[PDB]
Amino acid sequence: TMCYSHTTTSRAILTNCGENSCYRKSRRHPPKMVLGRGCGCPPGDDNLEVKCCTSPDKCNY
Amino acid sequence: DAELLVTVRGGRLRGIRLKTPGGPVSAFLGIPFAEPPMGPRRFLPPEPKQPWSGVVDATTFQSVCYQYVDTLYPGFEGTEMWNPNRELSEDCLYLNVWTPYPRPTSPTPVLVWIYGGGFYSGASSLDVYDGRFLVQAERTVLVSMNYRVGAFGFLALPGSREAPGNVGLLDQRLALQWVQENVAAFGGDPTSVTLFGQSAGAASVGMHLLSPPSRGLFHRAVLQSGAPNGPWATVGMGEARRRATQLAHLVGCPNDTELVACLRTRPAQVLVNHEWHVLPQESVFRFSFVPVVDGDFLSDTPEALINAGDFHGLQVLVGVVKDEGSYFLVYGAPGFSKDNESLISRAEFLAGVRVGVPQVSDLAAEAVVLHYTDWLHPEDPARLREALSDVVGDHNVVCPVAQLAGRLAAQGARVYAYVFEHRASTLSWPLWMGVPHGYEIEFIFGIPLDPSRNYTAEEKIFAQRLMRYWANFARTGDPNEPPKAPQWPPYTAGAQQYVSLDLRPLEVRRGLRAQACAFWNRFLPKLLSAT
Numbered sequence: 001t002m003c004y005s006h007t008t009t010s011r012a013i014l015t016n017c018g019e020n021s022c023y024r025k026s027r028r029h030p031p032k033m034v035l036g037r038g039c040g041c042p043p044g045d046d047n048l049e050v051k052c053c054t055s056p057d058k059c060n061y
Numbered sequence: 062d063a064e065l066l067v068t069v070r071g072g073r074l075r076g077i078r079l080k081t082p083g084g085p086v087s088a089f090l091g092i093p094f095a096e097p098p099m100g101p102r103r104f105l106p107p108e109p110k111q112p113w114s115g116v117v118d119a120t121t122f123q124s125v126c127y128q129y130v131d132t133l134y135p136g137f138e139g140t141e142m143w144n145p146n147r148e149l150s151e152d153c154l155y156l157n158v159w160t161p162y163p164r165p166t167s168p169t170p171v172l173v174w175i176y177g178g179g180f181y182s183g184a185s186s187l188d189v190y191d192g193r194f195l196v197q198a199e200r201t202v203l204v205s206m207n208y209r210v211g212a213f214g215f216l217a218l219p220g221s222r223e224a225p226g227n228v229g230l231l232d233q234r235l236a237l238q239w240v241q242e243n244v245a246a247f248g249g250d251p252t253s254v255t256l257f258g259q260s261a262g263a264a265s266v267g268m269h270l271l272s273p274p275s276r277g278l279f280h281r282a283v284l285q286s287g288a289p290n291g292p293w294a295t296v297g298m299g300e301a302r303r304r305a306t307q308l309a310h311l312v313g314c315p316n317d318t319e320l321v322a323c324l325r326t327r328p329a330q331v332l333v334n335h336e337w338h339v340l341p342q343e344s345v346f347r348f349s350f351v352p353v354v355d356g357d358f359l360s361d362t363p364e365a366l367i368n369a370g371d372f373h374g375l376q377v378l379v380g381v382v383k384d385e386g387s388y389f390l391v392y393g394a395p396g397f398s399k400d401n402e403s404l405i406s407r408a409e410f411l412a413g414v415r416v417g418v419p420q421v422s423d424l425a426a427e428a429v430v431l432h433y434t435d436w437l438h439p440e441d442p443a444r445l446r447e448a449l450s451d452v453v454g455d456h457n458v459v460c461p462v463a464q465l466a467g468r469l470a471a472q473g474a475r476v477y478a479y480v481f482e483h484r485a486s487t488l489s490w491p492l493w494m495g496v497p498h499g500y501e502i503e504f505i506f507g508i509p510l511d512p513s514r515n516y517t518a519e520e521k522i523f524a525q526r527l528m529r530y531w532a533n534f535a536r537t538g539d540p541n542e543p544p545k546a547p548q549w550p551p552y553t554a555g556a557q558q559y560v561s562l563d564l565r566p567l568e569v570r571r572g573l574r575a576q577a578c579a580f581w582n583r584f585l586p587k588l589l590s591a592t
């Protein structure tokens with residue numbers, strides 16, 4: 001799949017995730033700042049909310 | 062050539078000429094003004110840049126101070142226009158000078174700009190802060206600098222020599238001192254330095270105003286949509302180290318010395334990765350590492366100081382935009398998004414009040430809801446959307462700015478207040494957001510004059526009209542033409558007059574969102590106190 005990819009200190013860029021899903025890691029509670037998007041479906045936490053997707057393509061936006 | 066070479070106390074510099082629809086300007090970008098805060102220096106107050114042999118390349122902007130990059134909306138201008146446009150580095154303490162061409166013959170008034178970004182972001186190299194137009198148009202020296210942000214510039218362990226805090230404001234000060242010693246080399250006049258900044262940059266300005274050591278470095282101040290007394294501008298020593306410790310823990314650290322030592326070993330990005338975790342949560346318009354009331358830079362709380370201060374012989378220009386609040390709601394307020402009119406439900410509206418106004422009793426929210434609710438149309442979305450937007454704006458920007466203005470004016474200072482209410486034609490944000498936070502800057506800097514950009518012919522004139530105001534203030538401590546055009550009255554604590562800044566001529570109005578600010582400044586306090 002064609003998803004977004006970036007870090008805490010970088011800008012978002014399209015990248016080919018392929019078969020695996022994608023993710024949108026962000027601060028769980030407001031300010032719900034975006035901390036990173038990429039391939040896969042990584043674990044979150046109390047502060048970190050991770051939203052995974054697969055079909056949409058560029059869905060981890 | 063010729064005047065693209067200047068020698069300062071530290072050494073020689075090789076600037077460059079920038080082109081403008083009116084003429085060229087001489088710009089010297091990336092002048093090092095402090096020894097880079099690397100490793101052992103990280104977290105410590107800046108140290109003066111040691112004299113260099115040879116010539117320094119001042120033809121381009123230097124590294125942006127290491128920071129978090131707001132990736133909320135990938136590929137969106139309204140969001141990316143503030144992102145760093147240069148490489149991130151801890152080695153980032155550089156300043157920039159824009160001087161008229163040909164270099165002025167007599168010492169000309171200087172304007173120093175401190176960018177905003179909630180103390181967690183920002184850079185003087187952004188396109189919207191390009192001095193070339195304002196310098197060319199008003200022929201005045203313009204200086205802007207880079208100051209550390211995030212933990213790098215504000216993480217504090219109150220009382221420690223390893224992580225004192227406020228080093229970000231110290232960077233700013235070091236630059237103003239550099240200006241006092243070298244600005245003359247560009248025809249700049251050190252006896253006429255006017256500071257102007259927006260948001261946290263305006264908050265910074267206000268703190269230099271409340272901090273004695275900074276007082277001999279400027280003569281006039283301009284706070285745009287931000288004040289030192291805002292609920293987000295400062296944090297107490299308590300909170301300060303609670304946060305600086307949470308960060309240390311999250312990053313696996315470890316005695317302050319022991320803690321800071323460990324901290325200093327962590328890669329910069331590792332620290333930024335956990336920056337937003339330390340926030341006491343549940344809110345909008347709140348940033349992790351901000352200035353601390355340490356008793357040092359700030360001998361007391363901004364509020365305390367503003368009240369007790371004697372401001373005679375001072376001229377300040379203060380103002381806000383038509384919709385301070387809007388911008389922030391999309392970062393958590395339930396039902397808000399840039400991708401639709403965010404026509405919230407009375408339900409979300411009530412939950413948003415709690416978001417936009419953190420740490421406050423349930424009864425306190427009731428008081429807010431009571432005031433900001435139109436009881437003839439309690440369920441109308443359109444109004445609740447504008448209402449939550451006012452709550453945030455008023456609480457965070459308008460009422461804090463309004464209060465300061467009243468105190469300053471009331472206590473000896475000449476004050477001028479404005480309300481920038483004109484949405485740019487090029488504006489990339491939704492229409493429901495009106496004239497958001499930070500969208501008056503592009504005009505103050507005369508960006509409409511830039512060809513590559515599609516502004517209207519009427520906006521190009523507006524910007525010129527605005528630049529004149531700012532310049533006249535810098536030069537004389539008074540906005541209007543030092544004529545037969547609408548006059549800008551000073552802001553008195555009583556009459557509370559200000560002018561609306563749009564394409565139409567100056568219109569004077571009374572009351573800076575007065576009815577609302579009485580709630581925030583007079584009542585809300587008494588309420589919380591008694592509970």
Ligand SMILES: *[C@@H]1O[C@H](CO)[C@@H](O[C@@H]2O[C@H](CO)[C@@H](O)[C@H](O)[C@H]2NC(C)=O)[C@H](O)[C@H]1NC(C)=O
Nearest residue numbers: 393394395396397398399400401402403404405
């Ligand atoms: C405008 O966009 C926002 C955000 O995409 C929408 O809000 C979401 O609404 C759904 C319900 O359909 C909730 O489950 C989500 O939690 C909301 N997201 C958040 C936290 O804001 C909103 O519905 C849209 N408004 C319009 C015009 O339909």
